[PDB]
Write a protein that binds this DNA or RNA. Structure first.
Ligand SMILES: [Mg+2]
Ligand SMILES: [Mg+2]
Ligand SMILES: [Mg+2]
Ligand SMILES: [Mg+2]
Ligand SMILES: [Mg+2]
Ligand SMILES: [Mg+2]
Ligand SMILES: [Mg+2]
Ligand SMILES: [Mg+2]
Ligand SMILES: [Mg+2]
Ligand SMILES: [Mg+2]
Ligand SMILES: [Mg+2]
Ligand SMILES: [Mg+2]
Ligand SMILES: [Mg+2]
Ligand SMILES: [Mg+2]
Ligand SMILES: [Mg+2]
Ligand SMILES: [Mg+2]
Ligand SMILES: [Mg+2]
Ligand SMILES: [Mg+2]
Ligand SMILES: [Mg+2]
Ligand SMILES: [Mg+2]
Ligand SMILES: [Mg+2]
Ligand SMILES: [Mg+2]
Ligand SMILES: [Mg+2]
Ligand SMILES: [Mg+2]
Ligand SMILES: [Mg+2]
Lengths: 73, 119, 101, 88
RNA sequence: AAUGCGCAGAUACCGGGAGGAACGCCGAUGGCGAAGGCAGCCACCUGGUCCACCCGUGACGCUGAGGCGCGAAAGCGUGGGGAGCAAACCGGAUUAGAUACCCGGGUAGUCCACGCCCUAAACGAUGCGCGCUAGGUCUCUGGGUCUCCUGGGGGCCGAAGCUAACGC
């Protein structure tokens, strides 16, 4: 059980240090602005650690959010 | 007396009460209700029924402004948070949408001893 | 000298007249500290992820210079002075890290 | 930081013969470069104790080497010092 | 439940502002450091460390009484700060009592600078270094002809052996 789709699979090629590729970094956050776990991102220890540092830079630039409202219920 | 038609329903749920606030399309409240506004004095206020009543009360006081549709917004986890939502879905008031916006810190103020327990 | 990327976000409600005046003050402060712009990418207005300074959008400026480290902080400081300058993020250049690719 | 050009100039200046990258002089010279850059760092950032632990070690490694030199060749020793400015 | 707070209009809601402290998700199933300990992001300054090449020196090594430095929290001095929290303390309630546990308040303190204090279940309750003795498995990090192999670190199960036993 708990079988979703991996974020890495859906993407093709991309630089984990590009803190401006919103269109692609967005794919790494939840319905909420939270940074997806590794079970969802499919990244590796090392990569996930860089992604995190990148998503955070874009957030400071106002390109990515810190948190969004959950719509549903 | 301003015929607003559509607005926002705010459900403030907590383990002690549920307070509902209906507002106009941009935040300003029209009418509100709560577990205490409906007679429940003690802890009955936290009960889910009190929520259901508080919501219904809120909606009725809203229809008085010709309110038809509204966007719900929940904050809190306490009981009756769900009855409050359902109440509004049975109150003729069209629930345009439901959104959870509970405020959560990015770790700031040291919580009360009560809310720290095992951290 | 080392490679940097001076990011600057500015007021999106600016006309062609000021848009340039500020770019001048900017392109000037770089020279003031020894910044040889190796290349630039002036994107422009973009829908922000959240409002900065009550504004739902911001005008972006990206440079790739090479200046004296000891002055990277004063350069970044100065730039922040302008009111039409909402953000100033000077990261250090790095090799891209490919993945899934 | 100490750059390759910076370091390279120190190595050749003390090498005992072309290509000597590890003799007692080269080492002591190199450690002295580090020790000084660090002593300067600590004039400021005085609360930087962690870094100061590295200083003690370098300083210690240096005296250990010197002590060896001074024992094997008391000449090169008194020579290495005069050229630097250690043990004063 | 009560104290408390609210018609000098609170709670709930929207907008603006001030300030202090902490730093969500990523986060561990981890990482770094000699220990204490260390996680928003950026720049600077700076320490340790691992690997490959096996190029240089050539035993220059190990340990370390005393000395010296570092050393969580609380605490002390001087000055500053003060959101939230909270010893004392002031109240409410519980109780046979209640100098407690629960609730409403609250000062020191918690924060910063500088100086001091030097303690801990400062724990792996396991000084440091080196050599030698089956493997299996998971993992962090580097090299490689990248099934699998090779080095460093983190866990687990287990050969021989050890151990009063537990266990190692
Ligand atoms: Mg009145
Ligand atoms: Mg309030
Ligand atoms: Mg407000
Ligand atoms: Mg204040
Ligand atoms: Mg260790
Ligand atoms: Mg610890
Ligand atoms: Mg280093
Ligand atoms: Mg050799
Ligand atoms: Mg020889
Ligand atoms: Mg020793
Ligand atoms: Mg000895
Ligand atoms: Mg101490
Ligand atoms: Mg203290
Ligand atoms: Mg004090
Ligand atoms: Mg004080
Ligand atoms: Mg004061
Ligand atoms: Mg309190
Ligand atoms: Mg209390
Ligand atoms: Mg202090
Ligand atoms: Mg002991
Ligand atoms: Mg590999
Ligand atoms: Mg191992
Ligand atoms: Mg570990
Ligand atoms: Mg056995
Ligand atoms: Mg046995």
């Amino acid at each position: 059980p708990s079988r979703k789709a991996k974020v890495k699979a859906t993407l093709g090629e991309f630089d984990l240090r590009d803190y401006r590729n919103v269109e692609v970094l967005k794919r790494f956050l939840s319905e909420t602005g939270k940074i997806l776990p590794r079970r969802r991102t499919g990244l590796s220890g090392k990569e996930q650690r860089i992604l995190a540092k990148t998503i955070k830079r874009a957030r400071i630039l106002g390109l990515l959010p810190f948190t969004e409202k959950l719509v549903r219920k | 007396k301003r015929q607003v038609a559509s607005g926002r329903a705010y459900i403030h749920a907590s383990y002690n009460n549920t307070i509902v606030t209906i507002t106009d399309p941009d935040g300003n409240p029209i009418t509100w209700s709560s577990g205490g506004v409906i007679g429940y004095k003690g802890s009955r206020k936290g009960t889910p029924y009190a929520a259901q009543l508080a919501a219904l009360d809120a909606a009725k006081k809203a229809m008085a402004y010709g309110m038809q549709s509204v966007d719900v917004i929940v904050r809190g986890t306490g009981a009756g948070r769900e009855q409050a939502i359902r109440a509004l879905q049975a109150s003729g008031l069209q629930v345009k949408s439901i959104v959870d916006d509970t405020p959560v810190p990015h770790n700031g103020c040291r919580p009360k001893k009560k809310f720290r327990k095992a951290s | 000298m080392r490679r940097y990327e001076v990011n600057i976000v500015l007021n999106p409600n600016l006309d062609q007249s000021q848009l340039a005046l500020e770019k001048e003050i900017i392109q000037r402060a770089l020279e003031n500290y020894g910044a040889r712009v190796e290349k630039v990418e002036e994107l422009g207005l973009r829908r922000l992820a959240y409002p900065i300074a009550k504004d739902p959008q911001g005008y972006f400026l990206w440079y790739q210079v090479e200046m004296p480290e000891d002055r990277v902080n004063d350069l970044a400081r100065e730039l922040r002075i302008r009111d039409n300058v909402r953000r100033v993020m000077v990261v250090k250049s790095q090799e891209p890290f490919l993945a899934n690719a | 930081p100490i750059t390759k050009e910076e370091k390279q100039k120190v190595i050749q200046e003390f090498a005992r013969f072309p290509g000597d990258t590890g003799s007692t002089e080269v080492q002591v010279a190199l450690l002295t470069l580090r020790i000084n850059r660090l002593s300067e760092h600590l004039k400021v950032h005085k609360k930087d104790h962690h870094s100061h632990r590295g200083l003690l070690m370098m300083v210690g490694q240096r005296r250990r080497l010197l002590r060896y030199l001074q024992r094997e060749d008391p000449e090169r020793y008194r020579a290495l010092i005069e050229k630097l400015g250690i043990r004063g």
